[PDB]
Amino acid sequence: FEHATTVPNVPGIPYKALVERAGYAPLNLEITVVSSELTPSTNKEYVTCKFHTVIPSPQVKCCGSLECKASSKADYTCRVFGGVYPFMWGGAQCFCDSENTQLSEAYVEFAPDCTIDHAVALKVHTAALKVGLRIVYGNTTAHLDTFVNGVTPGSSRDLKVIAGPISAAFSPFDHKVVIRKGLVYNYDFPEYGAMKPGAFGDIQASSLDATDIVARTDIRLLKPSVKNIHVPYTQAVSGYEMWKNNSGRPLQETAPFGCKIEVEPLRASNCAYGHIPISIDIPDAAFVRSSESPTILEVSCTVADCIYSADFGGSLTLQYKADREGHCPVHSHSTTAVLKEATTHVTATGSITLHFSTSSPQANFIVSLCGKKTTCNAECKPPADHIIGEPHKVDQEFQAAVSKTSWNWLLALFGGASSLIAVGLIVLVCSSMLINTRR
Amino acid sequence: FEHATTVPNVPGIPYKALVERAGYAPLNLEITVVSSELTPSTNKEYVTCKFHTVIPSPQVKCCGSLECKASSKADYTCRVFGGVYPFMWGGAQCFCDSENTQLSEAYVEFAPDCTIDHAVALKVHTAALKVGLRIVYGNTTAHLDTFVNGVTPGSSRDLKVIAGPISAAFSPFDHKVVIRKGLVYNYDFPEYGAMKPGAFGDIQASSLDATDIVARTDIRLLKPSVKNIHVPYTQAVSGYEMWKNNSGRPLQETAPFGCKIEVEPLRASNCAYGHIPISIDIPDAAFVRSSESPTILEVSCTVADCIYSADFGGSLTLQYKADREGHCPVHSHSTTAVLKEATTHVTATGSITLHFSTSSPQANFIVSLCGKKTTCNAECKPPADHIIGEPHKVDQEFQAAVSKTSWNWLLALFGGASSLIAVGLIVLVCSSMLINTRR
Amino acid sequence: RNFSVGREGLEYVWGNHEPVRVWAQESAPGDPHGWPHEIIIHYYHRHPVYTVIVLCGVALAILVGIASSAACIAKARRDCLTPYALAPNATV
């Protein structure tokens, strides 16, 4: 037999539901998302890092021409200059007094440290949320992992868990991101081949070991304007490093919904957003016939003092009368309240005390024991502590957040107003009747 | 001098423009897409192929109980049977005939031939076009490859060019595509970890040799029911093989716009779709002040026997009066027609023979010989050649597809229709005035 | 085998040969410079729907022009005659 329920997409929170297998005694079902793994689809665009300018040893044909031929190196920008008459440490270094042409060369490659200091830009799209589930139900507990696409069954043991799609489409990563040393930054990096001199993407390649390097750096070579041989040149400050100095802060401190961003592969861990549809086929052998389980003839709810808060600040008690001892399930059918306990070893007769949490000051919810239903009605107070170390175990509905008394006052004031317009209609009728009754 | 023009995205088609930079003698500019490589954001999901089922040497416990265990192998499935008493060629293989238990084990792995026959599921979010452009300007000729995005500067040492973005949002590939033996098919393949028994993606893994293979095959084991030791099993037919047998035609034979699809990497090529916004920085060393170029005082168009066709069915002799002999560029400014040649040697006086193609039924196109402009006009005939193996060199537009000699007829018809009611209105207004003014 | 192809052209692959590409001219019956009916037939074979919509629009505009002009002129003449149709012995 299969069951299905929506589940709040919040990590660590144990969601709880009751499966009402018809003639079988109900069974508790706590759905607990151990962790979430929103994996974006990604492709490497290019590797980049601090370009290491390489100016190869100059070439000189002291009495003739030199070709300014092309080469495949990144931003290969060689130029030829005459009258160089360069001096080396040993002295003059050319055949001719005047017609000495000199070839100056410059290109760039990844610095040696780039093997670690590099960053990779990646386009990312259509992120799919993976999740780790731990399911506990009756005397049985199981753990599972599933891609929440609404199609794949991440089945394990006997649980035919199927999950998704996500109630809201979301990704923390924008379609352009850059990964560095495990950090990541959303950044509209320039496209492959779009190297801009002095900005991120100054030098680019498909792999850091690759010779297929393309770059733009505004490298320009000046005349050897000194007697000592030299190759004076200038260029834009490594755009990669310039970016680093002003990169903005990473997504680990910018991703919403508290999702902790992680790399290798780039993925978002523990995201908390929307809700997860869940369906679970369970082997009927996990349930029991209603005659085998105990069942309660009579039950009533008396709520103790309670606090509406993220934690189990509420406490309630139930008197019960049962046919026999055994583990009855206990659950709240109302969405605005969840019980801490999920099972009770019911006696033939007695009472149980249960802890619960609620977001509505009106503790107005229907508790169930062994499938029987009991209404609870109490006024919870606000907690004395403004901030606590635990997320709210339940959402809130504004229609449910109005207190029984505040709701009565509102409906009494609008009732008054509506009674005055009703009196209006009454008198507007009777004013016609005054004429028509004695015409 | 920087110049920019739109260019029809068609490979091999000669597109021609004249850079009328009036401070210098006009220069011919012919731009032709020599090739294109529409290369989308290909990312691997999983490899797949005909899974080789492995039913390993079964386990038996001649006098004891056996248990099933979980395993990392894909779709790993086990069953246990008692009272099995299996035989082998030597005879009975156990001493007990009652509690003798047999563990049957089955799982899957990629067949050895999958190293070649493997299919791979590729997701492709969008294509970043890259076009190889051949450029000729003046006496010079050049080639360069530019990513069509309108941002990256492609360079040919001399020329620099920026092209893109393509006006059309075209992509031949669907979001989901699968490669096979260099063939490719757009297909609704299931995501990683999602497997449908007997359909494409029955077995899936990140690599053809990855140990973390995952699969679903509905493999189920029957009870061993014969003397000879056996592990009778049944399964869904391989979903990969089934898909292959009903794969439909590959995208190589289905992409529109004449796109040719290639593998390694997956790429579209020669796609004739939309137009390319192109801008070019023709080096000023390529021009001369108008005074240094030959120039003509008078020019005249003698178009005759022109045939509007994809090939150069139009031809004319262009008579001219010129200042000096030399080469002069020639171009058809109006997009409705394109000349075959772009420059010709010119004398001090004579006529130049020319050829052209047009889609309009008449030669009503503006033509210029290196400066001065004239408009041709003669009517062009359609050829009997309904089909030819050469692509059209001009679009067709309803702004001028109607012949002027027939358009004048349509205008005369609307003239009659409108003039009738015009006369009617005039006569009504006149009579209205007569009733009040000549009364 | 019959295959349609327009100005965009068509590619056919046969056997293991290289693909063959072909493109269609706007070749059709009639003549875009001939008699008006030769014009209409030529454009019809070039673009049936556009030719039909153009010819029907022209014919309808002509019919509306005729009907409206006749109504205008005959009504104006009728009301112009009206004073003389009424008045006997008046200027005919």
- Mutation target among C26, C31, C77 for the B interface, most CBs of B within 10 A: C26
Determine whether the interchain pair A125/B153 forms a contact, defined as Cβ–Cβ distance below 8 Å: no
Q: How far apart are the first and last CA of chain B?
A: 75
Closest CA to B317 of B352, B281, B267, B283: B352
Is residue B379 within 8 A of residue B305, CB to CB? The reply is no
From the list C13, C25, C72, the residue facing B253 with the nearest CB is C13
The tokens describing B251, both together, are 């995208």
- Bond from prior residue into A11 cis (ω within 30 degrees of 0): no
The residue written with tokens 């006369």 in the block is B423
CA distance B371 to B374: 10
Output the DSSP codes for A286-308.
GS-BTTTS--EEEEEEEE-S-B-
Across B65-86, b (16+ Cβ under 10 Å) vs e yields ebeeeeeebbbbbbbbbeebbb
Determine whether the interchain pair B149/A194 forms a contact, defined as Cβ–Cβ distance below 8 Å: yes
> What is the sign, positive or negative, of the torsion defined by CA atoms of A346, A350, A356, A360?
positive
Closest CA to B107 of B200, B208, B206, B212: B212
Given CB atoms, is B269 within the 8 Å cutoff of chain C?
A: no
Number of neighbours of residue C37 by Cβ within 10 angstroms:
9
CA separation (Å) from C23 to A16, B258, B391, C7? 67, 12, 6, 6
Closest CA to A172 of A248, A276, A252: A252
CA separation (Å) from A294 to A18, A316, A322, A368, B150? 16, 22, 7, 14, 75
B-chain CB neighbours of C9 within 8 Å are 258, 391-392
Four-point Cα dihedral A262, A263, A266, A268, nearest 10: -10
φ, ψ (nearest 5 deg) of residue B135: -125, 135
Determine whether the interchain pair B414/C58 forms a contact, defined as Cβ–Cβ distance below 8 Å: yes
The tokens describing C6, both together, are 């327009």
Write out the H or E segment, with its range, that includes residue A119: strand A119-137
Is residue B128 within 8 A of residue B78, CB to CB? The reply is no
The residue written with tokens 């000194």 in the block is A226
- Enter the resolution in angstroms: 4.0
The residue written with tokens 């075959």 in the block is B340
> DSSP letter at A284?
G
The residue written with tokens 């016609």 in the block is A432
Number of neighbours of residue B87 by Cβ within 10 angstroms:
14
Which residue type does B186 have?
Answer: N
Q: Which residues contact A436 (CB under 8 A, 6 or more apart)?
A: none
Chain B residue closest to A79 (CA)? B157
Closest CA to B268 of B86, B91, B11: B11
Orientation angle between helical segments B404-437 and C48-86, nearest 10 degrees: 20
CA distance A256 to A174: 12
Chains C and A make contact, 3+ CB pairs within 8 Å: no
- Bond from prior residue into A250 cis (ω within 30 degrees of 0): no
CA distance A48 to A115: 10
Write out the H or E segment, with its range, that includes residue A53: strand A51-54
Is residue C32 within 8 A of residue B382, CB to CB? The reply is yes
CA distance B133 to B276: 11
Chain B, chain C: beta-carbon pairs less than 8 Å apart: 116
Chains B and A make contact, 3+ CB pairs within 8 Å: yes
Is residue B24 within 8 A of residue B287, CB to CB? The reply is yes
Number of neighbours of residue B172 by Cβ within 10 angstroms:
22
Breaks following residues of chain B (C-to-N distance > 2.5 Å): none
Four-point Cα dihedral B264, B265, B266, B268, nearest 10: -110
CA distance A102 to A87: 13
- CA B392 to chain C, closest CA, distance in angstroms equals 7
Determine whether the interchain pair C61/B387 forms a contact, defined as Cβ–Cβ distance below 8 Å: no
Q: Which residues contact B429 (CB under 8 A, 6 or more apart)?
A: none
The tokens describing B151, both together, are 């941002």
φ, ψ (nearest 5 deg) of residue B430: -60, -50
CA distance A203 to B90: 72
CA separation (Å) from A386 to A310, A356, A383, B320? 11, 19, 7, 94
Is residue B379 within 8 A of residue B362, CB to CB? The reply is yes
- B373 three-state secondary structure: strand
- Mutation target among B192, B202, B218 for the A interface, most CBs of A within 10 A: B192
Name A192's bridge partners.
Answer: none
Write out the H or E segment, with its range, that includes residue A277: strand A275-281
CA distance B214 to A211: 37
Residue count (chain B): 439
CA atoms within 13 A on the CB side of A340: 15
CA distance A216 to A235: 10
The residue written with tokens 């003798």 in the block is B100
The tokens describing A281, both together, are 């086929």
- CA B161 to chain A, closest CA, distance in angstroms equals 12
CA separation (Å) from A304 to A20, A111, A298, A356, A374? 28, 70, 20, 11, 15
- A400 three-state secondary structure: helix
- Bond from prior residue into B165 cis (ω within 30 degrees of 0): yes
Output the DSSP codes for B193-243.
T---TTSS-SEEBSSTT-S--EE----EEPPP-SSB----EE-PPPHHHHH
From the list B382, B398, B427, the residue facing C76 with the nearest CB is B427
Q: What is the largest CA-CA distance in chain B?
A: 136
φ, ψ (nearest 5 deg) of residue B239: -65, -30
CA distance B32 to A198: 33
Is residue B371 within 8 A of residue B296, CB to CB? The reply is yes
From the list C36, C54, C65, the residue facing B420 with the nearest CB is C65
From the list B381, B418, B428, the residue facing C76 with the nearest CB is B428
Residue count (chain A): 439
- CA B310 to chain C, closest CA, distance in angstroms equals 7
Closest CA to A28 of A6, A11, A3: A3
Output the DSSP codes for A315-351.
EEEEEEEESS-EEEEEEE-STTEEES--EEEE-SEEE
Residues from B in contact with A at Cβ < 8 Å: 41-43, 123, 125, 128, 147, 149, 151-154, 157, 190-195
The tokens describing B35, both together, are 């090739």
Q: Which residues contact A67 (CB under 8 A, 6 or more apart)?
A: none
- B406 three-state secondary structure: helix
CA distance A185 to A174: 9
Q: Which residues contact B139 (CB under 8 A, 6 or more apart)?
A: none
Is residue A222 within 8 A of residue A80, CB to CB? The reply is no
Is residue A191 within 8 A of residue A144, CB to CB? The reply is no
- C26 three-state secondary structure: coil
Closest CA to A280 of A113, A388, A390, A137: A137
Is residue B95 within 8 A of residue B60, CB to CB? The reply is no
CB-based burial of residue B89 (10 Å sphere; 0-12 exposed, 13-18 middle, 19+ buried)?
exposed
Determine whether the interchain pair B125/A128 forms a contact, defined as Cβ–Cβ distance below 8 Å: no
- CA A265 to chain B, closest CA, distance in angstroms equals 13
A-chain CB neighbours of B199 within 8 Å are none
Is residue B364 within 8 A of residue B376, CB to CB? The reply is yes
Closest CA to B329 of B359, B365, B373, B360: B373
Determine whether the interchain pair B191/A128 forms a contact, defined as Cβ–Cβ distance below 8 Å: yes
> What is the sign, positive or negative, of the torsion defined by CA atoms of B236, B239, B244, B249?
positive
The tokens describing B378, both together, are 């003669």
Is residue B310 within 8 A of residue B390, CB to CB? The reply is yes
Across A209-241, b (16+ Cβ under 10 Å) vs e yields eeeebbbbbebebeebeeeebebebebbebbbe
The tokens describing B213, both together, are 């293979």
Output the DSSP codes for B294-335.
--EEEEEEEEES-B-SSSS-EEEEEEEEESS-EEEEEE--ST
Closest CA to B177 of B259, B250, B121, B215: B121
Number of neighbours of residue C31 by Cβ within 10 angstroms:
17
Q: Give the distance, in angstroms, between the CA of residue A235 and the centroid of all CA atoms in the same chain.
A: 41
Output the DSSP codes for A189-255.
PPPTT---TTSS-SEEESSTT-S-EEE----EE----SSB----EE----HHHHHHHT----GGGT-
Which residue type does C57 have?
Answer: G
Determine whether the interchain pair B424/C31 forms a contact, defined as Cβ–Cβ distance below 8 Å: no
Write out the H or E segment, with its range, that includes residue A108: strand A107-110
CA distance A341 to A344: 8
From the list A41, A146, A193, the residue facing B147 with the nearest CB is A193
Chain C residue closest to B439 (CA)? C83
B-chain CB neighbours of C2 within 8 Å are none
Q: How far apart are the first and last CA of chain A?
A: 76
Q: Which residues contact A228 (CB under 8 A, 6 or more apart)?
A: A86, A87
Closest CA to C7 of B78, B202, B209, B395: B395
The tokens describing B191, both together, are 């995501």
The tokens describing C2, both together, are 């019959």
Closest CA to B245 of B306, B200, B307, B301: B200
From the list C32, C62, C72, the residue facing B416 with the nearest CB is C62
From the list B128, B157, B193, the residue facing A191 with the nearest CB is B128
Is residue B356 within 8 A of residue B339, CB to CB? The reply is yes
Q: Give the distance, in angstroms, between the CA of residue C72 and the centroid of all CA atoms in the same chain.
A: 26
Determine whether the interchain pair B424/C11 forms a contact, defined as Cβ–Cβ distance below 8 Å: no
CA distance B9 to B16: 13
Neighbours of C, requiring at least 3 CB pairs below 8 Å, are B
Is residue B19 within 8 A of residue B29, CB to CB? The reply is yes
- Bond from prior residue into A294 cis (ω within 30 degrees of 0): no
CA distance B258 to B20: 34
Name B4's bridge partners.
Answer: B279
Is residue A283 within 8 A of residue A202, CB to CB? The reply is no
CA distance B189 to B370: 58
